[PDB]
Curated annotation (Swiss-Prot), chains A, B:
Species in which this protein is naturally found: Aeromonas hydrophila
Protein's name in the database: Aerolysin
Sites annotated Important for oligomerization: 132
Region (Interaction with host N-linked glycan): 45-61
GO MF annotations in UniProt: identical protein binding; toxin activity
S-S bonds: 19-75, 159-164
PTM note: Proteolytic cleavage and subsequent release of the propeptide trigger a major conformation change, leading to the formation of a heptameric pre-pore that then inserts into the host membrane.
Record note on what altering residue 198 to A does: Impairs heptamerization
Result after altering residue 307 to A: No effect on heptamerization
Cellular compartments per GO CC: extracellular region; host cell plasma membrane; membrane
Annotated domain remarks: The C-terminal propeptide is required for normal protein folding and secretion; it maintains the aerolysin precursor in its soluble form and prevents premature heptamerization and pore formation.
Oligomeric form and interacting partners: Homodimer in solution; homoheptamer in the host membrane. After binding to GPI-anchored proteins in target membranes and proteolytic removal of the C-terminal propeptide, the protein assembles into a heptameric pre-pore complex. A further conformation change leads to insertion into the host membrane.
Chief localisation class: secreted
InterPro entries: Aerolysin-like_C, Aerolysin/haemolysin_CS, Aerolysn, APT_dom, APT_N_sf, CTDL_fold
């Protein structure tokens, strides 16, 4: 009923359905689901015990599952562990030009070069390392090629081994920069002093013999409030947001500012919104007198530095010849073929370029069309591959900074002046 | 980890990783990043010491970096200095016709001719100077050619040297004029006297036996306020602003005036906006009497001279033959080829025509596709090139003046007249 991950299966040679601690016999359906793996994990004429009086036979028997019994039995953890790839803390790159950010990314040995090199090594790529070292991911030269980057083992000096000198190459390209609204941060908030926006004056004249309250001067209508933004390092020209979001509330003044999706961050450097504030003055004027009235509207400015984080995605191409001894390609070629494969480090786009999709669906033999990650787990272990892929898929975020300003706080002043006799 | 600028590296011949004051040994990764420069800065079979027990070998060894040790060692400042091109104070040209502004720009020897001449000289152009002087950028003739300008060393009289008479030419063209809203300035502000815009009168008649307050006369609706602008010298026909901006607040009266981007400044010489002011009169009329009521609306005019600054950008083409001894083109040709290259003095447009981009990315050998600025630094020094490029890239701003007027201040008057008996 539940999915079965082949890496957790193990054969106990103890007797009829014995298994070990926290290990239970495997049933017929789970067997059939992972028959390819299980039969590849046993001898040609070997016969092993399943649950419910069933047995699975070796490749010589064509992997038949038949009712029977045997002295050994395949077993599965009663408390299986999830093999999901851990998500690590994001790697933060300081804001800068696009090329500078890429340069800082690809020259980080611990976080980029070594993880990708070890991934290529695990997948079966040959000569992932330079001649001046015997360890994977060492003595690697980084070069700028076109709009992308190439990391390749140094080939200077001599080398020993078959086709040594055909070093594996790791190519980075197709950089894209999203934007995370939730990553917003701001510096010191500066609020300017009240500034007089406009003023309207008037006179209320009463030449009658009784006081009059029948006056009304009203100032209303939409008042446009403008907001402005600046960009610092020029990477913003490539930054986009997949979903429209509102500018975050800073202080206690909400600005109805919308950032459009699928548009350059550097193109949206200003705008205006509407606020409706109305004021009115209705004086009571004594007989034979005039009263002056005034309505004033003031604005104020709020400004602060801003910093967002742009998620960085790219395309990682591994190019080189797969090792004869063992590689992770599902056909397991043994002719040392030249091979190129592109992964998309970032959001899912397709199954072939998605490490996470292939890793998660490794319990479905029919979905294994590119890489056999179960083979990698068997060769190197579950934890090792988990950590390596977590480092490879570690989120990378580039700073996006600037300055922001907006006319937000609005104030009013309504004045009824002293009466003046009409004799004037 | 951090970028390494080759101009700051220096070889100490002292012993095993000695270096000098505030100078540390260079590691393997930084070496590999700037290997081309470092290996070009050493002898064919020379061997120099890196950090962590590594050594870098000369061109004869093909620039190999291998674990080892040597009696000398490359070293890098522990407190590196930024080689960024300084930004100087803007050069202000008085407002005038386009041709006059260009004429004043290109005839400024100290600010335009000599800097560009020295830039061409540093890049390796030959004969940047006239025959009547032995110094660069002297005895240079300026001529109007089509819609652009040409500065070339005077070729009158005799000359000594190979291909003397093939003087280098500096061509200016492609002038563009932006506009900086923040550069706004205004002269003396003139406010006119209140002028009666409109008047509505009425009668409130009460033929009953009790006082009546049930009257209301209301004057409201949008009131169009017009603004006008004049242009003085005719350069405004070419002036445009990349971003829409609001007319600055002058005095304490905000005018909702928007200047459209990508449109001629001289085409936007007026407009109108809407302000909503409403007045009402609700008299209390005594029995058997009539009262006259009046509502008046007045406007006023605010006018002042205005001055903005238009940032001037242009295309600077250097044409001439590169010196055999040494030039800054990345291929370092030695056949004295005729060569033409255009820089864009102003906003970035492309890598090839951007001095700032090439200068900043000089630590990436793969981005060095046009000019080798590290070669210029080695030949002439960092400070010299910094100052020369700052003068070349010095911002230039042309005046844009005129007169501005707008109907801004609005006033009202509400009058309730004296009662008149109905016997009349």
């Amino acid at each position: 009923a539940e999915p079965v991950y082949p890496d957790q299966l193990r054969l106990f040679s103890l007797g009829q359905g014995v298994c070990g601690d926290k290990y239970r016999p495997v049933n017929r359906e789970e067997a059939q689901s992972v028959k390819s793996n299980i039969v590849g994990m046993m001898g040609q004429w070997q016969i092993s015990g399943l649950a419910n009086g069933w047995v699975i036979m070796g490749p010589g028997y064509n992997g038949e599952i038949k009712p029977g019994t045997a002295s050994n039995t395949w077993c599965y953890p009663t408390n299986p562990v999830t093999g999901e790839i851990p998500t690590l803390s994001a790697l933060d790159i300081p804001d800068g030009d696009e090329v500078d950010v890429q340069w800082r990314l690809v020259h980080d040995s611990a976080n980029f070069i070594k993880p990708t090199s070890y991934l290529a090594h695990y997948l079966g790529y040959a000569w992932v390392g330079g001649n001046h070292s015997q360890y994977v991911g060492e003595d690697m030269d980084v070069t700028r090629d076109g709009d992308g980057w190439v990391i390749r083992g140094n080939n200077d000096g001599g080398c020993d081994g078959y086709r040594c000198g055909d070093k594996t190459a790791i190519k980075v390209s197709n950089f894209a920069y999203n934007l995370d609204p939730d990553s917003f941060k701001h510096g010191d908030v500066t609020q300017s002093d009240r500034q007089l926006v406009k003023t309207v004056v008037g006179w209320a004249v009463n030449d009658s013999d009784t006081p009059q309250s029948g006056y009304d001067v009203t100032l209303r209508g939409d008042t446009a409030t403008n907001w402005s933004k600046t960009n610092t390092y020029g990477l913003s020209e490539k930054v986009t947001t997949k979903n429209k979001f509102k500018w975050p509330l800073v202080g206690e003044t909400e600005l109805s500012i919308e950032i459009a999706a699928n548009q350059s961050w550097a193109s949206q450097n200003g705008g205006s919104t509407t606020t409706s504030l109305s004021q009115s003055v209705r004086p009571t004027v004594p007989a034979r007198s005039k009263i002056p009235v005034k309505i004033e509207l003031y604005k104020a400015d709020i400004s602060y530095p801003y910093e967002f984080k742009a998620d960085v995605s790219y395309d990682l191409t591994l190019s080189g010849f797969l090792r004869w001894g063992g590689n992770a390609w599902y056909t397991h070629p043994d002719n040392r073929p030249n091979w190129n494969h592109t992964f998309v480090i970032g959001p899912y786009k397709d199954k072939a370029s998605s490490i996470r999709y292939q890793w998660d669906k490794r319990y479905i033999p029919g979905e294994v069309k590119w890489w056999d990650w179960n083979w990698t787990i068997q060769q190197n272990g579950l934890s090792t591959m988990q950590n390596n892929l977590a480092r490879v898929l570690r989120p990378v975020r580039a700073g996006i900074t600037g300055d922001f300003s907006a006319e937000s706080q609005f104030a009013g002043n309504i004045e009824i002046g002293a009466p003046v006799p009409l004799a004037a």
